[PDB]
Amino acid sequence: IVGGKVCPKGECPWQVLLLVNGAQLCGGTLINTIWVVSAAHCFDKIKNWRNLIAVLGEHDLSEHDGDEQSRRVAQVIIPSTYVPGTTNHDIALLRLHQPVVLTDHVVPLCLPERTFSERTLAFVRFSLVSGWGQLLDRGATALELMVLNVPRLMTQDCLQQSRKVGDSPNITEYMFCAGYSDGSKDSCKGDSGGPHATHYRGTWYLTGIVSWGQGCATVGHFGVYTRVSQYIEWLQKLMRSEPRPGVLLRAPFP
Amino acid sequence: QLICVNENGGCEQYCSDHTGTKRSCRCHEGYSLLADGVSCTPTVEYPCGKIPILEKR
Ligand SMILES: CCOc1cc(OC(C)C)c(F)c([C@@H](Nc2ccc(C(=N)N)cc2)c2nc(-c3ccccc3C(N)=O)c[nH]2)c1
Ligand SMILES: [Ca+2]
């Protein structure tokens, strides 16, 4: 997170820390006691599927305070339409082996219904983005969980306000822009998979996933996020399924 | 007739349209609908999308 602040401990209780062989991999969002929503691109280079851990109630990486809860990831579900190394359909649904215990420091973010998310949440201008990613482009990652408030843009406006760059990926109906074009504030690669959380009438909802951008907080560019509303039914159906042997599962999308 | 299209039909969380001018508001799991028919109240200690340290202070 570039140009944000420390998220006070317990104020981002749905934030997930994903680890592989104990090493920081990505962010994620707890949506109930068993399920975590993240980015499909987080798993492009995974060889050790059995060493994937989701840590809940994490705040400071340098110390164990007793609020952290770790779970082994039993399954990583990715839509069939996602192509490794590309940007479209950047979503992953993660099943924890056992549920986490909800506490003051461990609370899910609401996965909203599609129509409510499209008609109401899509028009709440500001939303929070968080993670232990880079504090600067080509800089060190954060030791304490960081949070940033970002405004959402309509894709036509995002395209007009962005510097034209050759071979830049298309911003599809499965993505949205949020952030600033002045180089001051953005999410970064280390925040990948992390939440874009929207407030509505006293409750927070999942509307986006840290996905991609041209560098981090680059002048003339915005952060690009997975448009979660396009995946509500796909996620709901999978949450009702039985797990299958093998951690990685490619599921048909739609 | 269409109701949910207009200001989420007054619903705090989810809106459902029914035959005629009937509208039903719904809530996410861990919440129940109040008798006003629009508001949602938690049924559990840790409902989704609420920050306990902020809710308790
Ligand atoms: C579909 C992803 O598409 C991407 C395309 C990118 O570049 C475009 C071609 C322009 C790009 F830079 C990134 C990086 N993520 C972000 C994210 C946010 C912001 C931002 N400014 N908001 C910038 C960059 C990234 N994540 C990894 C990564 C992170 C953890 C585990 C594994 C990996 C991995 N797969 O290498 C490597 N690189 C992703
Ligand atoms: Ca810690």
SS3 of B27-39: the string is CCCCEEECCCCCC
Nearest CB partner across the interface for B52, out of A8, A107, A204:
A107
Helical (H) or strand (E) element with A117: helix A114-119
- Domain of B32: which CATH number? 2.10.25.10
Q: CB of A178 within 8 A of CB of A151? A: yes
- Structural tokens at position A24: 């920081």
Query: How many helices, marked H, and strands, marked E, lie in chain B?
Result: 1, 4
Q: How far apart are CA A112 and CA A206, in angstroms?
A: 7
Q: CB of A207 within 8 A of CB of A228? A: yes
Q: How far apart are CA A126 and CA A197, in angstroms?
A: 9
Structural domain boundaries, residue B33: 1-57
Look at the block and give the residue holding tokens 């305070």: A65
Q: How far apart are CA B23 and CA B2, in angstroms?
A: 9
Q: CB of A209 within 8 A of CB of A194? A: yes
DSSP string, A62-105: T---S--EEEEEEEEEEETT--TTS-SS--EEEEESSPPPPBTT
Q: How far apart are CA A122 and CA A61, in angstroms?
A: 33
Of B7, B43, B45, the closest CA to residue B28 belongs to B43
- Structural tokens at position B18: 């029914």
- Structural tokens at position A166: 């050759």
Strands A69-79 and A52-56: antiparallel
What domain count does chain B have?
1
Instruction: Name, in order, each residue with C-beta under 8 angstroms of B53's C-beta and a sequence gap of 6 or more.
Output: A8, A10, A11, A104
Spell out a b/e string for A144-175, using b for 16 or more CB atoms within 10 Å of the CB, else e: ebbbbebebbebeebeeebeeeeeeeebeebb
- The DSSP bridge partners found for residue B2 are none
Q: How far apart are CA A78 and CA A250, in angstroms?
A: 5
- The DSSP bridge partners found for residue B15 are B25
DSSP string, A3-64: S-EE--TTSSTTEEEEEETTEEEEEEEE-SSSEEEE-GGGGTT-S-GGGEEEEES--BTT--
**Chain B residues closer than 8 Å to A103 by CB:** 46
Task: Calculate the alpha carbon distances from A81 to A109, A173, A209, A253 in Å.
Answer: 25, 13, 17, 6
DSSP state of A240: T
Q: Name the residues around ion ligand 2, CB cutoff 5 A.
A: A 60
Nearest CA to ligand 1 atom 13: A212
Instruction: Name, in order, each residue with C-beta under 8 angstroms of A70's C-beta and a sequence gap of 6 or more.
Output: A53, A54, A55, A56
Q: CB of A129 within 8 A of CB of A178? A: yes
Q: Determine the distance in angstroms separating the CA of B4 from the nearest CA of chain A, rounded to an integer.
A: 9
DSSP string, A120-184: TGGG--EEEEEES-BSSTTSPBPSB-EEEEEEEE-HHHHHHSSPP-TTPPP--TTEEEES-SSSS
User: What residue ranges define each of the domains in chain A, with the CATH number in brackets?
Assistant: 1-12+109-229 (2.40.10.10), 13-108+230-243 (2.40.10.10)
Q: CB of A39 within 8 A of CB of A211? A: yes
Q: Record the resolution, in angstroms.
A: 2.3
**Chain A residues closer than 8 Å to B38 by CB:** none
Residue A186 marked in a binding site: yes
Q: How far apart are CA B29 and CA A32, in angstroms?
A: 10
Cα angle A144, A38, A99 (rounded to 5 degrees) comes to: 85
Any alpha helices (H) in chain B, and if so which ranges?
A: 52-55
